[PDB]
Design a protein around this ligand. Structure first.
Ligand SMILES: *[C@@H]1O[C@H](CO)[C@@H](O[C@@H]2O[C@H](CO)[C@@H](O)[C@H](O)[C@H]2NC(C)=O)[C@H](O)[C@H]1NC(C)=O
Ligand SMILES: *[C@@H]1O[C@H](CO)[C@@H](O[C@@H]2O[C@H](CO)[C@@H](O)[C@H](O)[C@H]2NC(C)=O)[C@H](O)[C@H]1NC(C)=O
Ligand SMILES: CNC(=O)[C@H](Cc1c[nH]c2ccccc12)NC(=O)[C@@H](CC(=O)NO)CC(C)C
Ligand SMILES: CNC(=O)[C@H](Cc1c[nH]c2ccccc12)NC(=O)[C@@H](CC(=O)NO)CC(C)C
Ligand SMILES: [Ca+2]
Ligand SMILES: [Ca+2]
Ligand SMILES: [Ca+2]
Ligand SMILES: [Ca+2]
Ligand SMILES: [Co+3]
Ligand SMILES: [Zn+2]
Ligand SMILES: [Zn+2]
Lengths: 426, 426
């Protein structure tokens, strides 16, 4: 109730963690230079992690797998801390450059200094440079290694270590700071909360996108609640399965049934074509309709240029980019758009003030394209004595620039560093 | 059901296990190419083993450590069975030829196929071809890796897996078929009995020899029940120590104490000079007496020459070496000394028949020193057609020759490939 319609809508949204596992050189050697063995080892670990996170309304999906059999791609060392750091960086510049994934975990055969069996950036989930974690293949029992991985992933998802009071049952919980073969596959009531609050406050977007059945590289497992290649539906085990449209025993649709789950499926039958499946959430969202011959129901948004937010902007691919909200995202609450005069600094085409970067140079904004270059904000505070303040980033000079589609005038929005009319398909 | 003098005598003897550990290349990489780390690992493991086996009157002592930091000497595969064989043969071939030890254990970071976490020949202790075992550094907790090694060594000591009727408390025992991370460091009642029986019906001699304090390659540890360099005594950990003569904390004798161990040590004091500390086992043995100013009991014997074995041999360093028994030792029962004529082949000076080596050459025997070269025996098998038979080891050529002090002529014995008189100090 206290949660915005979006927050509640976010929490209710099923979660997916497109995971990308990585086995290091020692893992390859550890398993007799047998890629099949290493690969299988990982698959199993996943078969333990998946059912664990189901109780968190999160489906871990192995969308990728890499075994450094020819040689490691990062200086994996006894220092769990350094290893994590190097792994994350590699993951940010190398891996993410060729394979899109929500989180990556490193399974190494090396032995980290001290009792630590893994590390994972707290809340780093979805984050390009922090949604990672490392785990030592510390025990022969893969069930224990999986828990270790779930632990690290637990951190990535905002969860902390269980404190004395925290409980999940009569045995230790995944987030217990110390392992043991008496460890369960349950998260303490604390973890449950920490996670929830984390989600509410951050709402990491990436964990919302469901991977394609083909994106999953893990051997299809019937009963894991996820329809994988070769399966028609997955409602879990015959005992837990609650969908009459599916045969939990073989993961196949039952005679007559055309679909099992989905917004466009009622009583095991494709909803009539034209029937609405998803209503409009905002003034830029367009109610979705069922094709009638499919089980899914793609999402569509209003046509760009559609006035939104009391005529303060124009819809852009479902969103309503306002120059005001952008300042609040760059500097925080209370932040406001600097007066017009400020944007005139874009006509200088200097290091920060510009509109477009054709090749690598900087083109000064045209007198009528100023509000499309660098965004000048002003934190509405009785302290700040500067009306014009920009948000620069040495790494990305685009960061801090007026987002595309941002209303730069009446019936106009920024396309490519220029204030153009919103009456033209953009 | 009864126990023979030699058996009881053997049982009472303090047992020692000069262990040699070997780490594979993966172990090297598994610990960041840090020899200190790998050594420390092996050291910690021995620290857990020692106390376990002491309860068995067995003092484990690390007399050798070899880390294959450059390359493995054998092809360590995921097949435990094949690795055990390769290692067992390597030891019998390369290792034993470089350093003497009672038993070797291969600690590898490789993962064995299936649940197997180690392997070790049954009752192969002291055997040059079977006193070996392979252990997987499967867990991060060296405690479980120690129990694993203790388990394999257990087999080497004639111990077998525990039956559901065997116990050692509430926790599972070392020789438990399944390795629980809650496993204790105790041996089941069955384990202890099989061991006793094994020792009685075998009496592996190598474990009777105590390792010189200078042979222990492992760092001195006050509490390892072994008086190493810089220690006056070692009653184990200060917590378990029960010896009223030793300061378990400093491994120093307490005030008013002259000793803590020794046949000539009683109640922390030296037994008075003259006191008997050992009876004569055979006819070539002389009762031993305490000096009064020492805790040890030197085992003196009869002067070499004393008639023994019903006048078939002459005492030699506490033993009565006679060809009669030698043949039986080399070719089993029924084997008897061949007829004089045979020994003539020793004059041959050829490949096998000789009396002694200079360096690479062999000084053939002479008409009299003939019966002091290669021992000639013959099987009593009716199907036998050869009177002169020989035992020859291409590995060690000395093997098969007549034993020193062995009664050759009448009142003479073999000294150095020569039949010298027994009256002369040989
Ligand atoms: C690589 O590892 C795989 C297993 O991880 C080995 O294949 C297994 O072989 C056994 C028979 O000994 C089968 O019972 C298993 O089902 C197989 N595992 C599966 C499902 O692949 C394979 O032999 C190893 N490679 C080699 C030849 O060393
Ligand atoms: C090589 O391995 C040894 C471990 O045997 C490391 O030494 C340890 O260093 C830590 C400090 O980080 C101490 O707390 C431990 O007590 C040390 N172990 C012992 C007993 O030596 C050493 O730092 C490693 N070297 C490298 C390059 O990492
Ligand atoms: C197998 N090793 C373990 O169980 C050690 C135990 C431990 C860590 N710190 C300690 C301080 C005192 C006593 C024991 C420990 N803990 C770990 O590996 C945990 C480390 C962690 O919290 N990583 O984020 C991750 C694990 C939960 C998978
Ligand atoms: C960590 N894995 C284990 O505990 C497995 C369990 C196991 C062996 N055989 C089985 C058959 C069916 C199911 C499980 C097993 N056992 C071992 O590693 C034991 C193997 C052995 O007997 N070595 O001599 C050595 C061990 C005591 C250290
Ligand atoms: Ca499935
Ligand atoms: Ca829609
Ligand atoms: Ca000691
Ligand atoms: Ca004596
Ligand atoms: Co003792
Ligand atoms: Zn943690
Ligand atoms: Zn066994």
């Amino acid at each position: 109730s206290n949660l915005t319609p979006e927050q509640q809508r976010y929490l209710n949204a099923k979660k997916y963690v497109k995971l990308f596992l990585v086995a290091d050189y020692i893992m390859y050697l550890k398993y007799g230079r047998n890629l099949t063995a290493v690969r299988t080892r990982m698959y199993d670990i996943v078969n333990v992690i998946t059912p664990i996170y189901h109780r968190m309304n999160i489906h871990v999906a192995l969308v990728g797998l890499e075994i450094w059999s020819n040689t490691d791609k990062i200086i994996v060392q006894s220092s769990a801390d350094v290893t994590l750091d190097l792994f994350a960086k590699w993951r940010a510049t190398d891996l993410l450059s060729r394979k899109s994934h929500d989180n990556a975990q490193l399974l190494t055969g090396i032995n980290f200094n001290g009792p630590t069996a893994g590390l994972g950036y707290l809340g780093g989930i979805c984050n390009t440079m922090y949604s990672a974690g490392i785990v030592q293949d510390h025990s022969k029992i893969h069930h224990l290694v999986a828990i270790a991985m779930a632990h690290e992933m637990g951190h990535n998802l905002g969860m902390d270590h269980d404190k004395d009071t925290c409980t999940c049952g009569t045995r230790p919980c995944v987030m217990a700071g110390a392992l043991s073969c008496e460890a369960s596959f349950l998260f303490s009531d604390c973890s449950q909360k920490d996670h929830r609050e984390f989600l509410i406050k951050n709402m990491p977007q990436c964990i919302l996108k469901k991977p394609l059945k083909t994106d999953v590289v893990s051997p299809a497992v019937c009963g894991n609640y996820f329809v994988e290649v070769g399966e028609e539906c997955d409602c879990g085990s015959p005992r837990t399965c609650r969908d009459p449209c599916c045969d939990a025993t073989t993961c196949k649709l039952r005679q007559g049934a055309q679909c099992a789950e989905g917004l466009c499926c009622d009583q095991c039958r494709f909803k009539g074509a034209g029937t609405e499946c998803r209503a409009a959430k905002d003034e830029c969202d367009m109610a979705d309709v069922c094709t009638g011959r499919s089980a899914e129901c793609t999402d569509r948004f209003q046509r760009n240029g559609q006035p939104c937010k009391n005529n303060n902007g124009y819809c852009y691919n479902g969103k309503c980019p306002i120059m005001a909200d952008q300042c609040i995202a760059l500097f925080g609450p209370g932040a406001t758009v600097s007066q017009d005069a400020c944007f005139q600094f874009n006509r200088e085409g200097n290091h920060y003030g510009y509109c477009r970067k054709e090749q690598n140079t900087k083109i000064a904004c045209e007198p009528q394209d100023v509000k499309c270059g660098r965004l000048y904000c002003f934190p509405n505070s009785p302290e700040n004595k500067n009306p014009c303040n920009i948000y620069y980033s040495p790494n990305d000079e685009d960061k801090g620039m007026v987002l595309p589609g941002t209303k730069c005038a009446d019936r106009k929005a920024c396309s490519n560093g220029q204030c153009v009319d919103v009456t033209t398909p953009y």
